[PDB]
Symmetry: D3
């Protein structure tokens, strides 16, 4: 028996774990880049642990989600589903990299890390908006919802512009290097870039679900 | 979200409650004071109506909310009827300078108070509702309790109502027939306060069944 | 899901139906028997109330369901009023030992029976409802039929009610004025059984319009 | 979607409005004409009932729609009660050849007209509703206005009702007690036209709170 | 202050812009095929402009979407989301082609353009059904909805059959040519075919959303 | 005029057809592995037939889906949509294999068939839960729903663990063989593995939809 909590709290705790999980991809890739595969394997164990922890929070929620409630149970589940995908993506990406001992070519290392970080920043915005949501639930009234969405869109546009530029730069550099590499490796590098971008796509879906919830009120 | 409804119910209860000292004044022949108490009843009704107006013009503006706007409006409508009923009853009594016959006085007041008690139960359940909103399965216990408490009040008011009508029946031959009919109407109107309170509980119950 | 409501409606119909032999007893001066029949009426009401309580404390616990929990509760509330009305009417009649004047006796019973018939139609539609639930387009035919059947009953009860009031009016000068008013009230109360039955049909109709 | 409801409300208003010339006929001792006017009242009620039947058998068949089918049905039910009330009142008056005492005649007609005016407000809001449907935030102004207009009508009808009952009370000793009670009942029934109109507004308000 | 408009009108105007955006892929690819990369770049600027314009209409709708209304706000948003993806797909595809100066092999040029056009035709059907929807909203009654859906399915089956045949033909010809090409280019040609097909998949989702809306009434 | 049937029955009959369709992939691949392409073509004709049959059941449902009903029409449609994708996936996969006469390398044959079978088992669980759903609709009460979901999650976790292990093993073996193969073939083998896994992903979505339905009650 604790004090009253938002119906959104368990979702926020899940998002926080997910973000921690995705965040670990930076040091994971940084390890792969210095050639320390033993450390990369240990960081992947941290990713796997965070994903397992998220999965437990997710199970808890699915078997618990309720009487009088200010949001739809189904919207919370749909939100949980998208958040969960982010942690699985991070686990999957890191697994494929360990699996192929995939080395990001020297010339692409700096921009790749910048791109990866900006994609993780998108997850960060998703975390931010899910936390900022208590403010609307605790207070809120016809209108404050519109400002919230407008802000969310402004912040996502900024992140998308940067991630789009970095993704182009990265693909342009890879394209210049193709002739120096094995074609299967080349394809897996493009796939890695795409998978990383998927972290940001998934984060956008989180925000879309929030937006749909706000549009039912 | 329930807070403004609770404030309105409180005002409505205060309005209806004044019927006891109102009637007590008439019974001691204090018509000047009964007129003053009716002024307090009218004021409470007017204040209630203001709270009602504000809720009606605000609720629509509500965003995320744990109960239906429409359920709150329906609840408000039922609550409001109670204050209006108290105002109407008191006005008819002043208008006819209606005298309760001596032998009915004590049981009439006991019956009126028990009908008010029914309004009190409605006030109590609307305030206990925060507990359910602030905190599945608990809704059934809450409804079981409200039903238990209402059954107790209903049994008592039914007995009192029977007793009172039996006594009036015995006296009819000593009274003017129009006066008699107005005495029966007064008993019926007072009973209506309890019927309206029951409706408030029903609306709460429907709200809880939607979750 | 409709089954418990059907069981309750059946009990309610049985309760209201007892008003015919109740009144027939009073009309033959059998006040001891009318008291016994009123005991059966009270018992049916009590049993109905129990079924009501169980539904209210269960419905909330319902999972997947083809009708709204709230519609079932609203239906239950209307059905319950019918038994309560029968209990109330019979109690007032015992209380005043109310005698229907000789010349009104036959038409009064015919009118009461026709009002009961309205309760019977409600019972019939609530039972025919399984057919619609067990099996789009068929809902319109069902409502067209209920309206047709009710129009027939309403026409007959309107005529009887007019006839009965016309006869009482002709007799007023030979009776005590309070007794007269109670005779008009009794006619009105009996008519209310049909009004309540109509409300049961309306709630069914709303349920069907949600689909 | 609101159009058929508007047509029905218009018919209902026409039906209730005929109570003024109906009563005026009785007051000038024109019982043959009052019977003819009651025939017009019955006809309007019958036409209203037909429109009602068609809506009930059609609404269900509706596809995409900006309001709830159930809200429209509930609105229709309340509107219909007004025509039925006018028909019932007029029938009781013919049946008893009820004479309003001379001194109450003018204020009675003023009171009846003001109660009709309440029906008129309902008719007006149901027609202004297209404006809201054809075109967020505007719903609050619409409800604020309806409340303002109703408060004005209610104040006037309350005053008239008080005046009329005060005058009847002063005359009771000169009249037959049953006749007196029927005069009070008539005043109450007429007031009910305004109560029903208020319910029509409430249903509109609930519809607007769902959006 | 104009005359009454359908709640669907702003969605129709967005769909129209989206279709215009996707449509530009034909002349875009036609330019790449004659080897005029300067013109292809200029046509991509037209695609990018149409996507930016759509994005503004989309923002407008998201910050506006309402009182009494014949459809669910959330269904409109979900519809908008799918329509938006079509314009982004067109912008993304054209960007990758400019990025790699991707040349469709001679033998595949004619069938590729036919396939691309038929995929754009699917978008066209989506536009058609969104416009035809006013008819159901303006009139409509239990039943007219079923004929609408049946028609929609018939028309989509026809387009799907053709696009499936063209996609097979195109892949079969590419497969015969693989030995003459660089393997990375080969993979990007298959990807291009897939991305183009995605225009039709997205269009189908638009129709699915409409179908779900009709099923709530 | 038959006896009363669950609103879920037509969906169950569709799922059954879908499962039959996906199931045919085992003998289809087994034929491709013994080198009997004539038989593989005949088995694909059986797959195509099952998909066409499913498509007809689907059309029937879409043009029929109702008065009083214990579930949302829209949830049934959304469920149908996911089930349909499984049959299309099976038809698409088999078509690409016939198209390229794609041979699974000897060393990967046994594990590939095991993996394919376990993915089909996921479809099997989806079929199981859709059939078990009548039990909840026929009886059921606040609470039995939670046990149903908990069971579903337990069973899916088991299948996912196995499919994840088999997928890793299979990719690890392919990675060891890459140097012996044409790079385009290599990419298509990875794609095949991914597409097969997609059968299980689609099956999971079926279960997610069921879970959302149960969460509205
Ligand atoms: Cl790529
Ligand atoms: Cl009485
Ligand atoms: Cl009467
Ligand atoms: Cl009165
Ligand atoms: Cl491909
Ligand atoms: Cl892969």
């Amino acid at each position: 028996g604790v004090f009253a909590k938002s119906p959104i709290k368990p979702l926020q705790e899940h998002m926080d774990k997910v973000y921690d999980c995705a965040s670990l991809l930076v040091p994971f890739f940084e390890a792969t880049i210095t050639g320390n595969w033993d450390d990369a394997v240990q960081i992947r164990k941290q990713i796997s642990l965070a994903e397992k922890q998220g999965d437990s929070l997710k199970r808890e929620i699915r078997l618990t989600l309720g009487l009088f409630m200010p949001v739809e149970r189904t919207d919370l589940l749909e939100l949980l589903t998208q958040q969960d995908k982010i942690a699985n993506k991070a686990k999957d990406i890191s697994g494929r990299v360990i699996g192929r001992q995939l080395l990001i070519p020297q010339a692409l290392q700096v921009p790749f890390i910048a791109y990866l970080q900006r994609c993780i920043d998108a997850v960060g915005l998703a975390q931010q908006v899910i936390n900022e949501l208590d403010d609307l639930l605790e207070a809120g009234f016809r209108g404050r919802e519109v400002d919230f969405v407008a802000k969310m869109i402004n912040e996502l546009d900024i992140i998308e512009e940067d991630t789009d530029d970095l993704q182009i730069q990265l693909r342009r550099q890879l394209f210049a290097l193709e002739s120096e590499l094995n074609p299967v490796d080349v394809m897996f590098l493009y796939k890695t870039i795409e998978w990383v971008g998927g972290l940001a796509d998934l984060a956008e879906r989180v925000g879309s679900r929030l937006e749909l919830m706000l549009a039912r009120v």
